[model samples]
Target: MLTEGISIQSYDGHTFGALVGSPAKAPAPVIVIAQDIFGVNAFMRETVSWLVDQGYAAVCPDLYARQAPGTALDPQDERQREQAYKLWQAFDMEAGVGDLEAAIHYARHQPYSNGKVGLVGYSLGGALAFLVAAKGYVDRAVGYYGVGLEKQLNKVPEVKHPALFHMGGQDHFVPAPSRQLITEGFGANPLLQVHWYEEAGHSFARTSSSDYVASAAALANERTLDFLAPLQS
Candidate 1:
């Protein structure tokens, strides 16, 4: 697989850098990755490589480019925490989703793309994935522990594409009521599937985080691959 930095233009005509991962020469399905608060750091890049290895073209656009282009902060860096939060505060959900939509457009037109694009996201990106999927542009979407999503439960009816949502049972950020709401509200849709890791917390799949739980992350990844397989095919 080849991994490199490229540029993607948003709906509003702003150009941003993105990381692309592709097989040497195969036309494959695309996965548009929405990154975490940490931006497109090593963890995000590794995810793109993993998707490429799984026979998919993966692209992760820099959603923070408007404020902090190429902002790859260490999860443990105290000095960068305030800056990251500031960026988070400045983030516009609708604009971010538009950026993701543009990335999907770029992916489908890529030479190596099979003309199908999927979405996968973590943390804040996960919440954005839910919002974007609700907009009905992608083949499928998977959101892992999407924070601040319950408030947008009204958008659930707008999701027309097949979607998967993963939540950590012990995650205070999401809370039990929110999880219950999601399951009760969308679980019976047939097009939507929700899973909960009873022992994991936020960012449980991120190896760089203190919340990383190997067992839960592995299961989530396996479920994610399974959920994406038939859709990509």
Candidate 2:
């Protein structure tokens, strides 16, 4: 059942695909992934396996399913990259978050789930993961190179869920001003933790990205494993 994955029904009755995996232990804690722009591709599927090996059940939803079901793209291909941006262009963040919420709810009620859930996201999904955490759908959250977090700082003070964010110092997509805004905006939120990789750039932790930084990714993974310990044990 774990490898077979799951299907989630959206608010509008449209169903989307999710790749799910569970540990040998029954009713293990769960974590819902917000998914990268490439949909639930090989890397995302690898993520599900990775977390399952870490003693937790994991789910990665197809965020672009509403408009484009089975929207997997190869970030390495030039043509696919262009198509990905097109899909990203049409992605509705609010609806995406709602879909994540549905996935969370589904995981929580699953026979193999322990009821408590966490979230992990990268880039665009990273920002959505943070927004979902603020909504309190998940217990803890982790964001890797989350873009546009500064836009939601107004809700920082209101956030009750614990969150950790990994940012690359040289990510041109986020820029200096955006980083500063995030720093100043999230400074006082004790519930939030931001880790900066001065030597790395955006998608440093993404194994498939050209920007992948081994050292930074290793450290971030270590930190994320620590941050999500509660969900594992």
Candidate 3:
């Protein structure tokens, strides 16, 4: 996997941090990754390397640049969790989406880009992906256990891009009622696909996280790759 730290400039002239991972081949399809509540930490960067091994160019951006630049908190630490939560609460979704869009644009024009870009986000980033999908900028998007999506169900109708959503049946952050609400609102759309992992909880896919479940995460990864294959190729 070829990897490097890159800088991305948003529409408002704010230059933020980004990490790029690429296959040896040039001009490949790209995946713009959005960070979880933890900034672009080890897990997020590892994801970029893993995606590169799968032959895709991946870009992971620091979404909290304006609020907490260079932030990297340990989810396992109670103090860090508190700080992360505060940062999450202070987050500006609109401006964050703008940064994500900037990352997408940067990925599309990179020397290694194939001109196709998809969005893959987890947790807070997942909700952001849902909102970004509505704006019709990405070729495809996948959101994993978006914690606050139930509150924005009305925007489901505005999602013009093909999207996939994953939910953990045991996710306390997004409980059963909230998951049900999301499905009831967006399940019928042909452009949207939802997957449920009954045995999993939030951050189940991140092995370093306390909630990691290997079997479920493997399955989810397979499903995500399958859903993204068409768009990437």
Give the Å error, residue 226, model 3: 0.9
RMSD of 1: 2.0
Against the hidden true structure, what lDDT does model 1 obtain? 0.86
How many Å off is the CA of 200 in candidate 1? Answer: 0.3
Expressed as tens digits, the lDDT of each residue in 1-233 for candidate 3 is 11345678999999788777875787788999988988888888778878888778898888888986788788788998899999999999999999999999988888889899999999999998898898888999998888888898888788888988888889998777888888888876678888889999999999888789999899999888888888556
- Please state the error at residue 1 of candidate 1 in Å: 17
Give the local distance difference test score of model 2: 0.85
Tens-digit per-residue lDDT, 1-233, candidate 2 = 12344688877677788878876798798989877788888878778888888888898888888888777888899998898888888989989988988888888888898888999998888999789878888889999988889889998987798999999999987788888999988889899999889999988987878899999999999899889988765
Candidate 2 regions exceeding 4 Å error are 1-5
Model 2: residue 100 alpha-carbon error in angstroms = 0.4
lDDT of 1 by residue, 82-163 (tens): 7778888899889899999999999998889888889999989999989988899899999999998778878878889998
What TM-score does structure 1 among the candidates reach? 0.95
